[PDB]
Design an enzyme around this catalytic site. Sequence first.
Site, short mmCIF file in Angstrom:
data_model
loop_
_atom_site.label_atom_id
_atom_site.label_comp_id
_atom_site.label_asym_id
_atom_site.label_seq_id
_atom_site.Cartn_x
_atom_site.Cartn_y
_atom_site.Cartn_z
N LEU A 8 -56.87 36.16 -26.67
CA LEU A 8 -56.49 34.76 -26.36
C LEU A 8 -56.03 34.04 -27.63
O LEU A 8 -56.85 33.31 -28.17
CB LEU A 8 -57.69 34.01 -25.76
CG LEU A 8 -58.19 34.46 -24.39
CD1 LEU A 8 -59.43 33.68 -23.99
CD2 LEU A 8 -57.11 34.30 -23.32
N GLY A 9 -54.75 34.18 -28.02
CA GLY A 9 -54.13 33.46 -29.15
C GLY A 9 -53.08 32.43 -28.72
O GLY A 9 -53.16 31.93 -27.58
N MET A 11 -50.45 32.71 -27.57
CA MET A 11 -49.77 33.24 -26.36
C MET A 11 -50.79 33.56 -25.27
O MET A 11 -50.87 32.76 -24.32
CB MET A 11 -48.95 34.48 -26.73
CG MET A 11 -47.74 34.16 -27.60
SD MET A 11 -46.17 34.51 -26.78
CE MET A 11 -46.35 36.26 -26.45
N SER A 122 -41.89 37.07 -23.89
CA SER A 122 -41.16 36.26 -24.90
C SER A 122 -41.19 34.79 -24.49
O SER A 122 -41.49 34.56 -23.34
CB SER A 122 -39.75 36.77 -25.07
OG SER A 122 -38.85 36.06 -24.24
N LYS A 190 -37.81 44.56 -24.38
CA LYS A 190 -38.36 43.55 -25.32
C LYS A 190 -37.87 43.86 -26.74
O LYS A 190 -37.43 42.93 -27.41
CB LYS A 190 -39.89 43.56 -25.19
CG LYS A 190 -40.70 42.61 -26.07
CD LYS A 190 -40.24 41.18 -26.04
CE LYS A 190 -40.74 40.43 -27.26
NZ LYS A 190 -40.42 38.98 -27.18
N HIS A 193 -34.17 42.89 -26.82
CA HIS A 193 -34.09 41.42 -26.83
C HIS A 193 -34.30 41.03 -28.29
O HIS A 193 -33.55 40.19 -28.81
CB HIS A 193 -35.07 40.78 -25.82
CG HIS A 193 -35.33 39.36 -26.14
ND1 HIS A 193 -36.22 38.98 -27.12
CD2 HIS A 193 -34.74 38.22 -25.71
CE1 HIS A 193 -36.20 37.67 -27.25
NE2 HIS A 193 -35.30 37.18 -26.39
N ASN A 194 -35.24 41.67 -28.98
CA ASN A 194 -35.58 41.23 -30.36
C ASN A 194 -34.45 41.61 -31.33
O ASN A 194 -33.97 40.68 -32.03
CB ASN A 194 -37.00 41.68 -30.74
CG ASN A 194 -38.05 40.94 -29.94
OD1 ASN A 194 -37.77 40.36 -28.88
ND2 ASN A 194 -39.28 40.99 -30.41
N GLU A 197 -31.80 38.91 -30.81
CA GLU A 197 -32.38 37.72 -31.50
C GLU A 197 -31.98 37.77 -32.99
O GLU A 197 -31.27 36.85 -33.47
CB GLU A 197 -33.90 37.70 -31.26
CG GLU A 197 -34.61 36.41 -31.65
CD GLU A 197 -36.10 36.55 -31.91
OE1 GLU A 197 -36.86 36.48 -30.93
OE2 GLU A 197 -36.50 36.74 -33.09
N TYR A 198 -32.40 38.83 -33.70
CA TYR A 198 -32.23 38.95 -35.17
C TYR A 198 -30.75 38.71 -35.45
O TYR A 198 -30.41 37.82 -36.30
CB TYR A 198 -32.68 40.32 -35.69
CG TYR A 198 -34.16 40.63 -35.73
CD1 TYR A 198 -35.12 39.89 -35.06
CD2 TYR A 198 -34.61 41.71 -36.48
CE1 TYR A 198 -36.46 40.23 -35.10
CE2 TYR A 198 -35.93 42.07 -36.52
CZ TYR A 198 -36.87 41.33 -35.83
OH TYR A 198 -38.18 41.71 -35.92
#
Lengths: 325, 331, 323, 333
Positions: A8-9, A11, A122, A190, A193-194, A197-198
């Site tokens: 539980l952080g 996110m 995300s 994922k 997707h990253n 993004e970059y």
Amino acid sequence: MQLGMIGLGRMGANIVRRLAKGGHDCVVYDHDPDAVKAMAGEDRTTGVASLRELSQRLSAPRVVWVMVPAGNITTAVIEELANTLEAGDIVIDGGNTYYRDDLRHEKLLFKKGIHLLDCGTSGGVWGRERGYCLMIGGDGDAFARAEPIFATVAPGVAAAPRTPGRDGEVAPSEQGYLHCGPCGSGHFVKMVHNGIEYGMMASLAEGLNILRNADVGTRVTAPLPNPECYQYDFDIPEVAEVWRRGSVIGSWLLDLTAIALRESPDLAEFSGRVSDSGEGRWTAIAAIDEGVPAPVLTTALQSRFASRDLDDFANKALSAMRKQF
Amino acid sequence: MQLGMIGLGRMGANIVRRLAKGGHDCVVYDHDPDAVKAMAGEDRTTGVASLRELSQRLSAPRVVWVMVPAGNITTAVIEELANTLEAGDIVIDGGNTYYRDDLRHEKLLFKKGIHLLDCGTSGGVWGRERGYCLMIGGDGDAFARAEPIFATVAPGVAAAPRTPGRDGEVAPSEQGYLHCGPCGSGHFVKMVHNGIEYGMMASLAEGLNILRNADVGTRVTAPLPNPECYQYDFDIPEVAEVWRRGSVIGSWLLDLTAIALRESPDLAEFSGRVSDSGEGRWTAIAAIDEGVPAPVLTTALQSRFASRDLDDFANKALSAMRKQFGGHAEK
Amino acid sequence: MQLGMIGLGRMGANIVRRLAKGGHDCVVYDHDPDAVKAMAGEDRTTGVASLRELSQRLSAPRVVWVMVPAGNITTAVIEELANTLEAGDIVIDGGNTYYRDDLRHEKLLFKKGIHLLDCGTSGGVWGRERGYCLMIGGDGDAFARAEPIFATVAPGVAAAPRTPGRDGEVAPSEQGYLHCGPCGSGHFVKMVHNGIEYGMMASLAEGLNILRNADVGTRAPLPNPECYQYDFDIPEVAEVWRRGSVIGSWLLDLTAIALRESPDLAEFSGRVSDSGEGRWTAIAAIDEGVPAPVLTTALQSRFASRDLDDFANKALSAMRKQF
Amino acid sequence: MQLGMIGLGRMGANIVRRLAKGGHDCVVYDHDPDAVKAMAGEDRTTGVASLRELSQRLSAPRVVWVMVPAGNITTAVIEELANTLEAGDIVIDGGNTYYRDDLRHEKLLFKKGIHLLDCGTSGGVWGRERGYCLMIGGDGDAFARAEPIFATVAPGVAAAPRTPGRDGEVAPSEQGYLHCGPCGSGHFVKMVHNGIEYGMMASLAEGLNILRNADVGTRTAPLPNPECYQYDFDIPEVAEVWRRGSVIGSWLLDLTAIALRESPDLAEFSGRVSDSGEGRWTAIAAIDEGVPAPVLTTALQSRFASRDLDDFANKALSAMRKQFGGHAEKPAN
């Protein structure tokens, strides 16, 4: 519908808020017991004290979702979860796990009838009031059981217009979630997707730098021919804004970049040292194994590497060579 | 307010139709009378048949927009607009001109007291409906005088929600126009706009390709280690779709990319050879002179070159070297 | 001394013929009888047709060189070399094996006490005469035994003036061979030798390409067509660059040959293969956080030369066809 | 034959010396007193300190070589040589001049009947003994006339074995000098020669850095299979091994070997790298020509980042990375 949540952080929590608030019984937990109390005091949320208590405080077949930091902290949980669960019991994993990690885990689980669902989460410090794009991979019935969960945690079709082309009805993807395919598949998407993004951040970032330095013919390494062609001081914060309407590079990353430059016009509060979580790297490695030429995404990654001084020995090498001339 | 327009192609035609409709008087001209003809029936619009007639039917100071093929057509027009207009008049170059070319046009016009506004004009053909993101460089007053035009072709603040951080009244940028600075600075920001477009597109493209070929374990040159890891048949169009909301990589290009992949799953009917404006080159030449690392933007540009076979002698030199040292044949 | 040899292509055969003329005994074998025929005639060269006939012909402790196509065909010969050999037998893998597969191959021969010397073999099809640069890994003492082989196929110090500061005794390094460290370390250094080789090739290739299109004005508008009016004689720039220049190199020397035979390199398609060491280097680089744009970009150029950009070119076309 | 030199840095001088021994009459000059003294006490030399004195001390038709810094100064000196010299004479600009400038200088100098020959000069400091690679452009006949100078200051065919396929009599190419074509052609080739230099240096450096960090599995991104990365290679010995019987044999390997021998962790060296400009021009010719040059251009763009010129862009990434994923900028190690 009812759910488990280990870890539980920033996110794994904000998940469970728009899970409750939508209309789902959620049964939370963590290792450091601070996170399990604060959540338990809000709409339809209860904070158990072990993995067994959670499985027992859930309906068979049991959905159980792991957003703990990746690596060997993920693996121990999944070999603990193995003993603490039974058959029919699907096991979502929404942390930043290497699609290949999933392969060994889903074999340890598909032994005792325990199912894995690799989830590509995300959205970040917006994913609560904006929704969390998910890319789930595994069994087709296991997926179908949880499909309730996923819709509650996606942003929903409402988030943006439907696709000029989609006549007829409205499929998972449109809302913000997708059975990507089998084991790994989820995390794989994922990764990429990253990758993008970059690439997308780097493009904006490189162009903004270009603008910032348009004035090199006033600020006077080669001897610059034509310093008259470089006499411009650009309101970088307004240029960022103007591109937000009526142009092509309209994007969420410019919206944020138009913010960050409204607050901090010379982004002073950031040093330059850009970290990389490892999903950029596995995209690059995928490309090289597939023979997909990806110099744009792989060069965005290498710019981050350089931003943390990891070019150091090559730079000494070049300096040590020039001396020898 | 009152306006001149030379050049009536898709772009120059649509500006006048956004302007006239938004309550602007528009005197048009072109090389092609039938093209001039098209803008006579249209409300608040009027054709001519020479650059002297134009400036006789336009109240001093005049504001004349030039939307013509970039290079030696832009130049030749501007060269006569120096004999046609008087002092204090302004010329808007909305064309796709090199900022360096505006530096020559500025001096050749201020030698008859004519201000040169360089407008960088984006959007496409959507811009007639949505508006054209504008980028305007030159004189601060000339801008101010001519600003009612730029505000009108602009999309306008309505187009996108205001930025969290903009407290209060509505700045020129938020309309989708900006006085970017002195002469050329509009074409400059416009250049770099396109560079970024090349970067963002390439990032998606490379990305979609990495999905396309995840199936590389299924079919079986470098011995692919651990092939079992590459055994996915990805639904690229749905994957493109899902990213549209709740992701970080949400963009107008991703939207179009999702449309494009809906209509044709495997892009089977599409070219494979990708041409390049020249704004993309100029951006890369900018970045080198300023000492700005632009690996991502430049490498997107040179990817384009390689797709028109422009990398072929290099390729022949690698194969030639390979035969020499390794006896390596080409497959 | 006495040595095995499994695979007799353009390398392994020309290794033997070098090993022979420096007084070593060689026990050749490859699927094709005709391959093992030709050799059987050549000095100190013995044509068997069995791995077991091979290992019976060798006076323990044995040392056997494996020069077969990388991947499964390599694994197959090694598995079957476990049952064909006893203990104190050294296995020299001189093929283009991914170092990761060297680790697997080593344990699997540590379960019959058979030492693995993974040897990165360089020099191509000039190596019979000029010598093979070699980068070996695994056991200090197995290396130690096989050492006098490794100096024979290597070029020897005499191939190039000693490094300024190299005093005293000629080291292994200087002879054209080196023990790089434990198992893999050999094939790992060679992998990186090839990454560098891609980057040096591409550096020259792209450069020649700039000269070849410097005539671009005489045919995206070009500002200043008067600046691009040069018809360079690429064969002669290649040759001038050989003497007195910073960029002198064996690859310039080979480029220079090729342009003297074929001044437009007409007979080459430009569809350029990559055999795996470039890729493994770029993966080593990504995993270690070492930014290698120049090497990896050179690899990505070979991919593009084989239309492996095709789907992305299609995406970009399909995007353009809207905005 | 007989030759003028203007400018006497690490290059100007060593051509003078190499020519004198090759048996030519040198006349010299460079502002600085001591520099003109240093050259005047050697074979067939003559340290002056007027440009008018130099064209007196030379016999028409003459050949003057110019080796002063690129830009302002080199143009200054060509303007002044337009008065000082007379028709039929010849100017050798051997400086690191831009080819675009040679096209102006060739116009000026033609409006007084003189010929420009543009000479792209490489080699370094070793070129006094070894010789210099010359790449020359300009009028075909002015080359023929000055060829003996070029042939003397080049290393000559003896410096490397003849290329297989070179039949018969020694071509100039084979001496280490080439008439590359008309005005500028020479500086242009030298320009690309430098681009390639950047490309070969980067390729060696990135490789060294991959070896250097093969130990990362003993010492953020989680590293899969760190049993794989447990090598502590001897970079000075690997550099050295590669010099004989490999494919990447080159001068730059030879130099890198020496550098790593003297200094095996390159610990004393900065890791902020300059570029001189031939590299920038090479990258821009490539863009102008639609020649994809990602390997050369990235070698170039790797030096810019080495000088923190990626500063703003890095801040933009960290600005983006915060806003979306509240990502933390980790501290300076």
